[PDB]
Amino acid sequence: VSLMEKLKWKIKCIENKFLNYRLTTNETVVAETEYGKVKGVKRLTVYDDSYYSFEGIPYAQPPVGELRFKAPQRPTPWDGVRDCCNHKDKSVQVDFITGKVCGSEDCLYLSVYTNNLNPETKRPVLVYIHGGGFIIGENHRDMYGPDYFIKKDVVLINIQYRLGALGFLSLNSEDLNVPGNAGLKDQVMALRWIKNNCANFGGNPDNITVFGESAGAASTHYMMLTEQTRGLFHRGILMSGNAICPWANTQCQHRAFTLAKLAGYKGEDNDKDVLEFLMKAKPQDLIKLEEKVLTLEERTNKVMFPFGPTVEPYQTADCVLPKHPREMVKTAWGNSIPTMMGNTSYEGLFFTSILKQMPLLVKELETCVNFVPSELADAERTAPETLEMGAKIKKAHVTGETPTADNFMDLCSHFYFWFPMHRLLQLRFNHTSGTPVYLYRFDFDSEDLINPYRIMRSGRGVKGVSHTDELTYFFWNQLAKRMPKESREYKTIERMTGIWTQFATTGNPYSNEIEGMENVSWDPIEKSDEVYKCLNISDELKMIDVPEMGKIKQWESMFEKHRDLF
Template sequence: MKEALNVKLDGNSDHTPGDQRAYIGFRYRQHRRKTSEKLVVETVYGPVRGVKRISCWDDPYYSFERIPYAKPPVGELRFAEPQPPEPWKKIMNCTKEAEPPLQYDKIFNQLKGKEDCLYLNVYTTNAKPSTPKPVMIWIYGGGFELGGATKVIYSPDYFMRKDVVFVTFNYRVGALGFLSLKDPALKVPGNAGLKDQVMALKWVKNNIARFGGDPDNITVFGESAGGASTHYLMLTEQTRGLFHKAILMSGTVHMYWALTPDHDWAYRLAKKVGYTGVNDDAKVLEFLKKADGKAICRKGSNLLSAEEVKERLDICHGPRIEPYITDQCIIPKDPRLMARETWSNEIPLVLGGNSFEGLLLYPNVKRNMGILKELGDCAYLVPNDLNLDRNSEQCKEFGLRLKKEYFGDKEPTLFPYLNLLSYKVFWHGIHRTVLSRLKYASAPTYLYRFDFDSENFNHFRNLVCGKGVRGVCHADELTYMFNSMFGHHKDPGTKEYSTIQRMIGMWTQFAYNSDPNFAGIEPTMWRAVKKDNMPMKCMNISDEVTFIDLPEHESLKVWDSMYSEDKLI
């Protein structure tokens, strides 16, 4: 994941300036597409004023942005667990979105955002409907190091054609969101970014009825780190009763990058920023609280040693098992074990991924083709959570299984290697989550596979790979869900337009009644996965939608073979 986020666009030099121009143009269009009509809603903390906007399809809706759901995490609250916001009496102007959380953007090589970031946005077509609307809460991805609830990437236009209330929010990322210290007296156990998410969900539960939403019909969904975040929210007792169904897109807690190992990251970060003292939690925290936030973000984005890179570690500051329990604790133990007994085994779930997720890593591998010659017996590609000595015979034997599956008797080449990474980084985690649900959940689980390959509209692939590479990359489905700087709505009659309608139709139908089937995919029937039906069945979303055996099934069995059943799920 971290390698993927560290995308350099050299070799595609037109991308960065072009994307900057797209960003400016999109912000200008967004600014113009609002009216003078305002609406005031009284929240439990105070009144907020929104504005009526016009979507890209000319649908009017009300937009409430930059609503505080927690105190600003600054000063003494830097790294701390979130606190409820202070109430206010005067009408708060909520017609402009907040900046994203402070972060170092590796794609554009720049710092952006603010530490004062804990705000959310509510979009609704009718604040006083005759019947409360289903609520959909979006959680952005970005490897727990990037992202923000911004219309530049996640504009609600497509969802505003449906009868839902749509919510987005910022949560802290990087070291500012996930720093962890072992000393209980310091009250920084980690996972502050996930705790921000819980605080946002509580705000929605207590306030969304005032915007026309149904607090008893809330769907949480997210992509990549947002999908893994959503899964964590499904596992913790902190969220019981706060939502009622979920959608995990290319991200679950069963993916190795979704749980960060304890490698003394706080001390290593402090030294990078300029700390010269001893490795003492209290002194490290005192230094980091006073340090420049921008320096923390920039230096904290690259703490990995050469050996850790070789071990395929990706994220320094992300979710972790907390070293002690607090009132807001999210991850008290191995999330795989939490998934066995969680309350959310009783709520319906949609999950899946894209057919060639590994294209995300194309620029990194392309710049370092020597890595293919260094694969050897592929022992370093064996899953980290098996905790095997890389020089052991067992690890080497597992590596050779992978080598045979993806390369056969040939030398490793670029695209077969990227295909292997699709499984290692994403698909095996999706598969393990389905297996866990089949064993422990009583509610239905629906599996999908996004496979729509548009030459010009799969914008994330085009961004990271350049033109000429085909396949459905990680994050490509976002273009078909959000009007954004990367892609705008297509004309009716195109396959791209049909795919947008299908994605929004399935996701909102699931929000309506816990079943993703809707008229736009008939006569195909999307059925929940079954224990006695292998290979697993999935909804394949391509030029058409078809209900098929999961094409990745046979390769996934190779990955399964390395685990005992107790360790697999």
């Protein structure tokens, strides 16, 4: 990231701190938790609303020392009153703005917000799981501020969880108790905490909605798939992602050693000696080097992250993913709760920054063999059947004689988001009680209000609705500002938070009390539907056939001779 966005962000960091002190009140309050009393504080929003804020509530023991790479344990209860008027630190990660490593291993906390601690009726509980490829992200209010949602009478909760190698190291040897998915196991225990404690904050423990964007959507889906969380929540929202996206899992059991070797390990490739070295390494050294773990072949085959959710090699007590995601969908308890999914109208536009550095990537579309689903393609991507499958993808996105950056970015929308969603819907239909799934398409474009991800995708002055553009209308961030109440950006906040809280409440996203929706007939997707219908959200809300559907069926045809793998 540029030296200009570094000083610019430094300033907004200094501003956000003064604004956060300014927006604090003296009204402290105490709430009960099953671990002991927590003290929160009332805060202000630039729209002159206010909310009770409980930050830094531990839901697990700090996963430090011997607990590193291990499943989380329950935290130790305290006597007295725990201070929850400040944020705790984020998970150890690379700061996308500076490039420095920030965060702490002591990171397993959650935050609770609401405009009213003593509502006259129990409220819908919304749990947000942040994205960031399982390697970055946080529940700090400078990125995910509860300011828009607390205009509604809900209880909003933002959790953290272990990221990168510290979250998703995986070792084959069953003796060392490092099966993998530690960071997902953090999410589970946070869900259990929210289940047993939300009542103390005015929340309805029988009406809990989990949602997340990108990696947080994949996370949410995992929470819907695993046996560990059965019955914990009641609605799910998958925003630009799910667990069968090709970036949402990886078999990384062999990458532990590589990481050790980058961090200066001397010895042999056996899990034990590898683990002992990783266990005493400085946390920020492991995280800083993660960028270098993937081989050139892996990057070629579009492996996006070295460490992430994995099929655990053996089953232990807190196992989360005992089989591949496609297999878990076949029995998943979460298939039978109300579900909303969606994407933006130009998902792949996110990859502008990457293309700016590697223009050679555009030539991948001459045969498109690199984007053939990996389970179908051959190792070298050179088999005649792979070139054939490649050609189908090519027909779907290469508009001219030569592929462009736009063709590339359009393909990415499908490779990374639309096609996995399709496969998931079809797989789910063959294994579900018949609970509704609704689709949305986020199609509202604005430069007048933005979020920090736009700095990272280099989305400054770039038309179209990229991956993460929707976050801006759900959460306050330190680049946001007060918008006139009649502005299109403000209406979109009202609509988005309106629809999400309505879904959370009833399991049905439609409400005539949301402006723009008076003509809307939002029907869920049925197994007999050849064509998906979605609520397209722009300056006007309109039900339409998914415009991506033709290209979606184009990708599905790659599985013509391999229907069992679809």
